[PDB]
């Protein structure tokens, strides 16, 4: 489990949560490529159940 | 046919009578179901439903 540690220390009994959206700003986005995945699926409307439609 | 007794039989002739029976139909019997096209990616349930309907 410790092999996956990404934080120095856990959350204490009461540490203040710092808000980082303090102003309404248009976002700039960066990623390592392929961090986003697009999952696509077919619609089998060519099946025999659908006969009046081309 | 009726049967009658005696010799005279005058003014006692009968008629003819043949009865009838009527055969009719009923309402059609159906298995009727609806499936969205997303449900036909795997069509196994659809075929097994057809068999159940038979």
- CA angle B39–A45–B30, rounded 5-degree value: 65
Longest dimension (CA), chain B: 89
Where do we find the tokens 């005279």?
B8
**Resolution of the coordinates in A?**
2.8
The residues in B 16-35 lying below 8 A from A, measured between CB atoms, are: 35
Give buried/exposed letters for B10-20 (b at 16+ CB in 10 A, else e): eeeeeeeeeee
CB B44 within 8 A of CB B52: no
Q: Confirm or reject contact between A40 and chain B (CB < 8 A).
A: no
Question: Does any CB of chain B come closer than 8 Å to the CB of residue A44?
Answer: yes
Binary contact (A47, B38; C-beta < 8 A): no
Q: Within a 10 A sphere around the Cβ of B39, how many other Cβ atoms?
A: 14
Output the CA–CA distances (angstroms, integers) from residue A23 to A18, A20, A26, A27, B23, in the order listed.
Answer: 14, 9, 10, 11, 84
Chain B residues with CB under 8 Å of A51 CB are: none
């Amino acid at each position: 489990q410790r092999a996956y540690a990404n934080v120095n220390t856990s959350l204490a009994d009461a540490m203040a949560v710092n808000i980082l959206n303090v102003k309404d700003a248009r976002t700039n986005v960066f990623w390592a490529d392929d961090a986003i995945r697009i999952v696509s699926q077919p619609i089998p409307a060519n099946h025999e159940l659908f006969a009046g439609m081309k | 046919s009726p049967t009658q007794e005696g010799w005279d039989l005058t003014d006692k002739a009968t008629g003819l009578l043949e009865l009838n029976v009527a055969v009719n139909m009923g309402e059609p019997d159906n298995d009727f179901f609806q499936l969205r096209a997303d449900d036909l990616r795997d069509e196994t349930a659809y075929r097994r439903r057809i068999q159940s309907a038979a």
